Backbone:
């Protein structure tokens, strides 16, 4: 039996859900050979109301080199990056739910991803299987991928069909915990773009640049637009697409008119839909955002690590596109 | 004496400071024959402890059309937009501290700015005079403008100079209520870009696009780079620059090497430095972020409105630059 | 018109109610000649959830000598005492809701009370008139005083008559905000004893020692006892008594069997009952605990000060008792 | 392997630390063939953020009679008493950290202590061995005991020595989770008196009354008095003393002038110093307050219980002292 010493960065909705999940499942962990011991949890206010014991909180950075694992769910890019890099350099794995970090600091983080040090299931659709889904889909070659990767904007659109306004639905969305710190990342497509980028690097091109994703959010959408779509037998959704065009992978986020019976249209939560050769059509759906949902993903990754498996490896080499996609109707 | 009917959007660091500042200055407001009456205060979470009366909190949007003023300090772009437009269309002024909104929704908001309906001193360098400073600088023709517009990154570079880390500094500035909710906006220069855009529009080109600002942040800087600059007799700062190049106005945000005696290098606070013809060289500096500092700007604008002055007008035409310029050397 | 600069010690349920009340009533204050300006609010956690703007919070002591008034509602004895004494020494008045402080540090605080520097209506039965009540009763000579001075133990007994247990009622009492930090002060009679002491010093003996109060709390009481009392046509209540015996003032707190039609028994909140010569029988009742209720008392004292009146003066000399009381049935 | 059924009373600084410590040590507990199962956790406010599952929180008292252990860390005396007695009467052990309860409700609790049903290591000097230390010291006859039992006042006097104020120090210790909820209990010596009582009862007289302890606090001490002691080669500390005087045991808490090389003066932490016949002079020191420190004591007691050992027994008789003693000189 061994101690698994964990440094947690962030003690918010996710961090705190992860902390309590780990301790609540310590019996499971013992069957994996370990007892979980948190070194410290990095936060900003160490004395406010929080669902972690106060003495574990650290309002300043602390040395991570004695940890066996670093778990990050602090948000942002350059601050977690600088905090994680010395741990990575020492061969200490990272488990993160932070898609911005991986999408926008990939020049620094790719080499550690490639040696299997980075686990990040929770960074796309929370603890819904997305990355593991794609890992199994690698048995085939992608033809087209379409996801509804952002839960905030899904919630908002669901509410506006029901005739609620953007602002009341976003407000409602932010109470329920779905949005990023700044909901602009959600409603402009950027958070979907970060997720889509990570999917692209896993499946089709390990160098895929976040800057190459074309992203348009839901700012032109209203209840009227959505309800008129319903009347044509369609649903409008924000969709993240990956497809070949002129021999290269293209990545877009935009609102799309979907047939109402399409798997993407009938999903109540977040969803990833592929067509691949020779498998065919496959689809995964589940909760894409929330504390418990994300902590599930991070805990799934801890068990993966404990099992002796590497983190989520980028594609070993870029894959040649088989077909010209370019499906589509925008809005 | 008559009610001044205010709808306030946001009850946070800024909104709350503003609410309480208004209350305690009620004596001052009576000298205009008004008494301040809040129609409601839009907030996300009506349960958090707040220095605003529970009975005035609204967790859903409320009718604005009876207000004499809408004050906005909620953050984001699309949601505040959709909330203020009806008031603006009714000829109700807006007082805002939200630079993202004005930079990114200008196609919708410019017509109302041109009519004098938008007050936004607090949208740049908080209640430090920036917009009013530029309004006076209009007596001359701009040669060049350079500002340290972002308080969060000034704070960070000041603390890194003294040997503190990036991560520590950042944690503090967030604590002090300086950082945008997405602090990436601060540290990648985007928030300074938004501010720069507004200054360009006030001075030189009323349709200057936010997309035309070139922005880069502080992500490559460390305590070491800064300390080496100090030994060369310099300071590295993030600088927002507006200058002529090949007959057009260029807007850039980037780290710059400044001579250490330069006003920008020494300033107490955020700072704006302008050479213009025939005035010469003028400078303003003060706090550029903080609840109190921002509530001062908003309240300044409310007093401006009560005086019968219009809001901040865009430049009444676009005009080319007088002189070819450049910023300081990059890093 | 003048600035009234206020230093607040404590930003809890009371402190925060007082802060918001002051600002909410600044129009009233202007009719008294002043505009209220808080120098700072002393707390412990300056970044947690609180109904006061964060920049006013001070997590460390600050200089009080520039204030026009010090307002204290921090709890305890020696820490507020040391904080207030330099202000008192400088002739700066104190307004307090802190009965422990005044009861247990009277050797230090009496001399300042005697020069009218201490206002403390809110320290007995919150903003229910108690001290001002006694000030008017000084027109007569006390024969007997009996109060139900502690709201926690009143609540608890009210709930146990209804058949609820001590522990559920105390729990219920502490949620509703009635109890001291440690409810032992309430349930053992000590908080009533502190209040009774202050009443004694106002009315009958300016040197009355807190140590001379005999106090017994409600620890032997159960629903059964209380319900049996109801059946004999009585109510049991914790009562604070002041009466002459052998030519001296005696002070006791204890549970008592009251006739059910007695003013003390039929009071739903806290209550002070006197017999005095030549007035006769007089009685005041109201809320004895709670934020809003206490802030009312502190604000009543601020207006008193602004009116040019002194604070609550002790009796100028001990008064000779006229009759042997010693009413009573204990339980 | 069998459930160890625990009812926990209190979910605060101590309770929460305890809850999470139990969870993470579940592996260790399996070595006794148990798995820990919480039947519920009594709390005041089920809405505060807490590192305990919502579904286990109870805001009203719950049946305890199915528990194998009641752990108490709620504070107060009468309410915990009325809650544990039924469990105690059923032959269910109590593990407590509450020294006030044991000192002040001993007429009710002594019979169950005498039966081995009360574990209270954490009630004195937290998880620093104090009770177990004394249990071993029973191999000798006590000559004299002197301890620095109160962590809050040690902390305060340590910080005042270094020039900090009373008020600052106090604010900190409260922040660190050291202080009783009424910190007056700490600074007037009452909390050390409660602890002293329990040590007297374990060692010399199983009915030693709390009322017989003479207690005075640190209220006359300042940075100046302490600094002057240091210049005389001394340290002033609050000391809890048990010593023989005229054939009876005397118990006193007071500030004392200690030689600076004395173990009590130097100790790292709270400290207990005992001369006994024939052992000689023994000493123990460690942290005497804190969530983690206390949860360690409680967990030590739970392991003691699982080992088949009884709780902490009172002295099996009263006996007079062997030698006339005295404490150090007062201040
Ligand atoms: N919630 C979701 O549904 C969800 C789903 C999937 C992925 N994620 C990802 O999880 C991350 C965090 O989200 P969350 O919902 O847990 O955020 P949250 O509730 O705000 O918590 C973020 C935590 O990080 C701390 N923190 C933030 N910036 C910091 C800095 N510069 N220095 C030190 N501490 C810092 C905060 O401290 P304080 O608490 O003191 O302020 C807090 O403890 C993000 O990357 C997000 O994209 C979230
Ligand atoms: N802080 C500064 O230094 C500073 C300086 C100048 C300008 N500004 C600008 O001031 C604006 C507000 O900043 P801040 O510091 O006050 O942020 P803050 O502390 O987060 O306050 C945001 C307020 O708006 C509410 N809110 C956020 N999104 C909402 C939505 N979709 N619907 C309804 N209510 C919403 C929040 O409700 P809850 O409290 O219920 O969460 C909160 O009351 C930003 O535009 C910022 O760029 C800030
Ligand atoms: N509530 C009532 O019904 C009531 C009625 C009449 C009289 N009172 C009296 O009012 C006083 C306070 O009561 P409350 O209900 O407002 O208490 P509360 O909600 O706990 O607030 C007490 C405040 O004082 C601060 N504080 C406490 N000790 C401190 C120290 N040593 N150093 C610095 N700051 C300290 C706290 O800081 P934090 O908030 O950071 O912890 C908090 O801001 C007591 O004397 C009480 O007897 C209360
Ligand atoms: N802190 C230490 O260093 C230390 C060391 C040794 C012993 N102790 C002892 O441990 C005990 C608890 O101290 P602590 O630091 O954990 O205090 P704390 O942080 O205030 O926790 C008290 C807990 O009990 C709950 N509570 C209080 N009174 C209650 C009532 N009448 N009914 C139901 N629930 C009640 C509170 O509920 P909420 O959270 O809902 O408010 C809280 O969960 C005290 O007896 C103290 O003397 C403390
Ligand atoms: N804010 C993000 C979290 C994970 O994608 C969302 O709404 O989906
Ligand atoms: N985050 C912004 C707010 C004020 O514009 C700043 O740091 O300057
Ligand atoms: N806890 C106190 C406040 C004022 O007496 C009470 O219950 O009455
Ligand atoms: N307030 C107590 C808790 C531990 O007994 C102390 O300071 O020692
Ligand atoms: Na996932
Ligand atoms: Na400004
Ligand atoms: Na009163
Ligand atoms: Na102990």
Residues:
């Amino acid at each position: 039996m061994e101690a698994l010493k964990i440094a947690l960065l962030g003690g918010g909705t996710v961090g705190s859900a992860f902390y309590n999940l780990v301790l609540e499942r310590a019996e499971e962990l013992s069957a994996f050979g370990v007892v979980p011991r948190f070194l410290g949890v990095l936060v900003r206010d160490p004395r406010k109301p929080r669902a972690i014991p106060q003495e574990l909180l650290r309002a300043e950075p602390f040395d991570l080199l004695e940890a066996d694992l670093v778990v990050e769910a602090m948000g942002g890019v350059e601050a977690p990056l600088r905090l994680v890099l010395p741990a990575l350099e020492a061969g200490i794995p990272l488990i993160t739910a932070n898609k911005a970090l991986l999408a926008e600091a990939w020049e620094s983080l790719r080499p550690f991803a490639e040696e299997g040090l980075i686990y990040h299931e929770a960074s796309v659709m929370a603890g819904t299987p997305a990355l593991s889904f794609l890992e199994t889909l690698r048995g085939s070659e992608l033809l087209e991928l379409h996801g509804i990767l952002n839960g905030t904007t899904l919630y908002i659109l669901q509410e506006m069909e029901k005739g609620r306004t953007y602002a009341e639905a976003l407000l409602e969305a932010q109470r329920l915990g779905y949005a990023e710190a700044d909901p602009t990342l959600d409603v402009e497509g950027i958070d979907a773009a970060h997720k889509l980028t990570l999917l692209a690097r896993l499946l089709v091109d390990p160098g895929f640049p976040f800057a190459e994703v074309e992203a348009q959010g839901i700012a032109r959408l209203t209840p009227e637009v959505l309800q008129k779509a319903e009347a044509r037998g369609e649903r409008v959704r924000l969709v993240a697409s990956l497809f070949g065009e002129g021999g290269r992978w293209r990545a877009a986020v935009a609102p799309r008119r979907l047939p109402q019976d399409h798997p993407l249209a009938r999903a109540r939560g977040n969803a990833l839909w592929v067509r691949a050769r020779p498998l065919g059509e496959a689809f995964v759906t589940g909760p894409g955002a929330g504390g418990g949902a994300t902590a599930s993903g991070l805990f799934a990754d801890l068990l993966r690590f404990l099992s002796g498996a590497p983190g989520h490896l980028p594609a070993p080499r870029a894959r040649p596109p088989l077909e010209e996609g370019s499906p589509w109707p925008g809005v």
